[PDB]
Design a protein around this nucleic acid. Structure first.
Lengths: 150, 206, 98, 96, 127, 105
RNA sequence: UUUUUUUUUUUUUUUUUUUU
RNA sequence: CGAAGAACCUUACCUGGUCUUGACAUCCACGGAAGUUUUCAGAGAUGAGAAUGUGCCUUCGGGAACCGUGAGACAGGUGCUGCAUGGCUGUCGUCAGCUCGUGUUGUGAAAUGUUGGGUUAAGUCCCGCAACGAGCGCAACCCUUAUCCUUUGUUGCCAGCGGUCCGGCCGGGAACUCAAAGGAGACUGCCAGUGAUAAACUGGAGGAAGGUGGGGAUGACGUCAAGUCAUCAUGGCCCUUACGACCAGGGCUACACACGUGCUACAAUGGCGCAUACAAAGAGAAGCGACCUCGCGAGAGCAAGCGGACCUCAUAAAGUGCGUCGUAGUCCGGAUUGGAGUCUGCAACUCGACUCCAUGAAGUCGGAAUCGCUAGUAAUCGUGGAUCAGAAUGCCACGGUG
């Protein structure tokens, strides 16, 4: 496994030139069909701005602050039983793993449409109320805590 | 644990054909039934001196049979009454005439076949063939070649006895597709069952 | 657009052939085609001539198997007769059925 | 069933155009369900063992009917050798 | 006077011609917008020619032989690159540095028998 | 001796440049060896190991410059003397290099 | 020289003769 | 399972009819023209009648093409053993193999090149070492790419004009795809950093790949005492009133039980209704078959065509735009059972395979724990092929939204 080749390069969103808004959708896809999934994510960002009447896509961050973790738990039985030690995630990982908990909260969410299951949970996520934020805070209650047991 | 042909895999490389003919889409089948029949009559008419090469060409399906035998004078016979028989019986099956061409087997000592037609004669005496076997090999290699291996299988003792014997008078690199090597085999019997002999003759390096 | 499908066992023997048809036939009319290929079957061929049942001696040969297209605009006999007088080439085939 | 039935195919194999497949070319066209004539068919079905098409076939290079591959012209056991003199041009290293 | 290319990508089969002035993008008898009207890649074909002020200088004419819109977006990349590749030798450094010269050729030593990854040999720190 | 060694691809000839390497440094005073040597001259009986055994096996005369560590029973002529470096074997080699040419008569 | 992540899993019958 | 067709079916077996040169096939003996057609029996093999017929040479000798009856020789079958052996295929092994033609420290089962200093991810590569080198595995040819250079133009194909009766229609010329024959080019190649200016690892100039570029592929000794013991090619041994060969029937599928492969069906990241945008892998004269006639349609029929860009199967699914439910056991569930139809057949019915309506079994997100699947790789989105008088849900192979 000696050679550096270990992650996909992907291209930016069609509007704001950001691989952020692009990895969002490409986490949300779960069944394939991209370009109409990308137009429905573009419909999420307009339903978002109905709340406030401005560039709420700047507040995309002010939700994503609460969904990003510092730590993840992987296979570490080292010490004769389960001895975790999470280790932190490298800077490039903080917000892709936040997209992972935004999409598992959206799947059964219950809101009228899927544009609204994402745009509401982002709204909650800025409120720290969120179900994507609750999963992260669980890990912080878990393995960032278990710093003190390592 | 293998038997690995040097020849056959190499038709255009120092090691020339047993036979070659061009029969077309709906004219092969009878040509193939005739390629065992024409070789069965010849290899029983020529037995008195063997045939190193029993060469079937068919220049216009009519058959140019070139017989490298160690005594052509005995198949020219008393001067050409056998030739007449020899050009009729193989042409009787094939429905076409037969271009009988003769040759000598230039020194059976160094040959691509006639070493196994020493050995398989030796059994027609029924007594101690072991006196002569490995001596025949010796003799052959004294006029030509640079190594030879020999394998003999069959009923070669008494009552119920059945074994295989293996000998090596010189080195043999088993397959080298560049070299003047041959493989051959021949057969013999002894009134109890078979006696089947095999050779590998590393004569030269290219 | 009468397709004379020219075909030889070898590249050697259709080259020798076609270069006379695109000369001979064309002299007064129809712009005669002759180099344009079909799926030329450069295959690997294997026959068993092994003097006993042992390993290999299935001598793998290659082949060329090469076909082209002679094409004429009309049955203009004062230009085309010459290729039909070429009946004496009994060592190439042509399949004119169209 | 080794050789079996060959004689009884042979005895009528060449005349199926005379048991039907030309005998038909006027009387039997009015006998269609396209053309209606209902008393006519019931006298031409009589030929039974030689009603076309029905053919036991002949595997030939094999001496007994261990199938017949109607795409290639040989028995369901023979195939190996095609690859070894020219009969199946498409048989390289299998795709599996 | 004119400059040209052709492409092969998922699965098409497209050509492209550069032409003198007026700056437009004409696929057989219609505009870009009519052919990718929702199809989110659409900018990537006009992007490297809007650098070099196309609007009074070039004109772009296209035709297509098995559509393939999701894959066409790179058949055109390679094609429109072969055209600019004789317009001005200067920009081979811009086309490379922007990825606009690259074309699909690679698998990353993938599976043949069972194992996932299949070129790299046994590795150790002193066996 | 001629140009013919620069045959085939260039890495075929070099793959023998690098035999010639591994062999003329070990072997460059013996290049023929078409008969068996008749006599030997040695300077170590440790570092030269096998040669003294091969020689005593076959019955060869051995001329041997030896120190307080030696085994003199394994030779035909000892010359007791300082074991190693240039000054010692200089002081003997004049008269060896003489006798082996003016002695041809 | 701290080295318990469970203890156990019936018999056979494999064996291409021999003197060198 | 082997059966890629266990109801004529390549017959296991249940039955009966029959035979044991059988069904196929020779060497002499005595003889004959070969066949078309119909009637009646019989389950089939086989039985009883009736008409019409008479070939080519040609010593009228000998006979052919081709059918008899008498002889004496005389025919057969997956029956398995890997172990008489030699092809073949595997999972290991893409380890850079083990041993010898010599020599000799080990008497010999110890590899004896692994030592003793170092090095590289690397049996990498600098030495050192009592070790050579013989050479069949080696240096690699191999096919498809893909990018081009010429010759080139194809049912192709249309760059720029020439006419449009708006069909590349046919004029008209060679950009270039298409097609492809011969082939031909990328190397540490020069630049930034690295360290031993070794080592090779990153980013790049320069590209169609990069440090086997990829995808096919060759699979050496050694292969588990693993198979192909059901075509092997054949030594040792096989049943012969018999494991030999002719023939119509039948029934394999039950069910209380599993248990899983293989299926789906639980509604919106969904579909439902009319409307809009783009590909192809492959197959084809025991063929494939349009338009066009007939339509509730499976399914009838006419009939242009097509031999490999021409004929036809797909008018890939998503997707887009406007309409339509309201979270609803239903509008979807084809599990299935009322009646209604046919393409085949001696033959499918207590045995199907499928077409039209009428339906409505479970339905509602079930845990325990068999391994699917690391990248262009299982979800996701589809097509073909032969066995064969022919319905696999198998597998087999490349494509792509992902």
């Amino acid at each position: 496994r000696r050679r550096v080749i270990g992650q996909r390069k992907i291209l930016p969103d069609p509007k704001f030139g950001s691989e952020l808004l692009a990895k969002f959708v490409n986490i949300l896809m779960v069944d394939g069909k991209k370009s109409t999934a990308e137009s429905i994510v573009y419909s999420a960002l307009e339903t978002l701005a109905q709340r406030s009447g401005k560039s709420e896509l700047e507040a995309f961050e002010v939700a994503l602050e609460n969904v990003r973790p510092t730590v993840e738990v992987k296979s570490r039985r080292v010490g004769g039983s389960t001895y975790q030690v999470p280790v932190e995630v490298r800077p490039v990982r903080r917000n892709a793993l936040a997209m992972r908990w935004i999409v598992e909260a959206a799947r059964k969410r219950g809101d009228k449409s899927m544009a609204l299951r994402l745009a509401n949970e982002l709204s909650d996520a800025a409120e720290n109320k969120g179900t994507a934020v609750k999963k992260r805070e669980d890990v912080h209650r878990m393995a960032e805590a278990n710093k003190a047991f390592a | 644990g293998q038997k690995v042909h040097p020849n056959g895999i190499r038709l255009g490389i120092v090691k020339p054909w047993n036979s070659t003919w061009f029969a077309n889409t709906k004219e092969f089948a009878d040509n193939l039934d005739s390629d065992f029949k024409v070789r069965q009559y010849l290899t029983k008419e020529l037995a008195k001196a063997s045939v190193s090469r029993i060469v079937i060409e068919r220049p216009a399906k009519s058959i140019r049979v070139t017989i490298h035998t160690a005594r052509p004078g005995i198949v020219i016979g008393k001067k050409g009454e056998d030739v007449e028989k020899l050009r009729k019986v193989v042409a009787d099956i094939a429905g076409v005439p037969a271009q009988i061409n003769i040759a000598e087997v230039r020194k059976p000592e160094l040959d691509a076949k006639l070493v196994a037609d020493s050995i398989t004669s030796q059994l027609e005496r029924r007594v101690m063939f072991r006196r002569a076997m490995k001596r025949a090999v010796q003799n052959a290699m004294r006029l030509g070649a640079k190594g030879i291996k020999v394998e003999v299988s069959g009923r070669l003792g008494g009552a119920e006895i059945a074994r295989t014997e293996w000998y090596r008078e010189g080195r043999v690199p088993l397959h080298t597709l560049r070299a003047d090597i041959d493989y051959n085999t021949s057969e013999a019997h002894t009134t109890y069952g078979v006696i089947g002999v095999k050779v590998w003759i590393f004569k030269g390096e290219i | 657009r009468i397709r004379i499908r020219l075909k030889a066992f070898d590249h050697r023997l259709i080259d020798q052939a076609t270069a006379e048809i695109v000369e001979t036939a064309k002299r007064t009319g129809a712009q005669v085609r002759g180099p344009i290929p079909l799926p030329t079957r450069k295959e690997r061929f294997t026959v068993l001539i092994s003097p006993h049942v042992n390993k290999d001696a299935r001598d793998q040969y290659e082949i060329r198997t090469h076909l082209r297209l002679v094409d004429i605009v009309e049955p203009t006999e004062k230009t085309v007769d010459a290729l039909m007088r070429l009946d004496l080439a009994a060592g190439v085939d042509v399949q004119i059925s169209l | 069933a080794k050789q079996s039935m060959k004689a009884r195919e042979v005895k009528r194999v060449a005349l199926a155009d005379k048991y039907f497949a030309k005998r038909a070319e006027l009387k039997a066209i009015i006998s269609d369900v396209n053309d209606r004539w209902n008393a006519v068919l019931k006298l031409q079905t009589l030929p039974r063992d030689s009603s076309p098409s029905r053919q036991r076939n002949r595997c030939r290079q094999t001496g007994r009917p261990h199938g017949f591959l109607r795409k290639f012209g040989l028995s369901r056991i023979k195939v190996r050798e095609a690859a070894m003199r020219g009969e199946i041009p498409g048989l390289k290293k299998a795709s599996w | 006077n004119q400059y040209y290319g052709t492409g092969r990508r998922k699965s098409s089969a497209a050509r492209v011609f550069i032409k003198p002035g007026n700056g437009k993008i004409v696929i057989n008898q219609r505009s870009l917008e009519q052919y990718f009207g929702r199809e989110t890649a659409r900018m990537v074909v006009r992007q490297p020619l809007e650098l070099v002020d196309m609007v009074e200088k070039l004109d772009l004419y296209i035709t297509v032989k098995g559509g393939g819109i999701s894959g066409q977006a790179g058949a055109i990349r390679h094609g429109i690159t072969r055209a600019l590749m004789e317009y001005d030798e200067s920009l081979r450094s811009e086309l490379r540095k922007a990825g606009f010269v690259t074309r699909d050729a690679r698998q990353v030593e993938r599976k043949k028998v069972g194992l996932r990854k299949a070129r790299r040999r046994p590795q150790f720190s002193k066996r | 001796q001629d140009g013919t060694f620069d045959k085939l691809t260039k890495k075929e000839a070099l793959m023998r440049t690098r035999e010639l390497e591994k062999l003329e440094n070990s072997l460059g005073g013996i290049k023929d060896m078409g008969g068996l040597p008749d006599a030997l001259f040695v300077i170590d009986a440790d570092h030269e190991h096998i040669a003294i055994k091969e020689a005593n096996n076959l019955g060869i005369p051995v001329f041997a410059i030896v120190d307080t560590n030696s085994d003199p029973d394994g030779v035909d002529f000892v010359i007791p003397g300082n074991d190693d470096a240039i000054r010692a074997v200089t002081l003997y080699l004049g008269a060896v290099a003489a006798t082996v040419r003016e002695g041809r008569s």
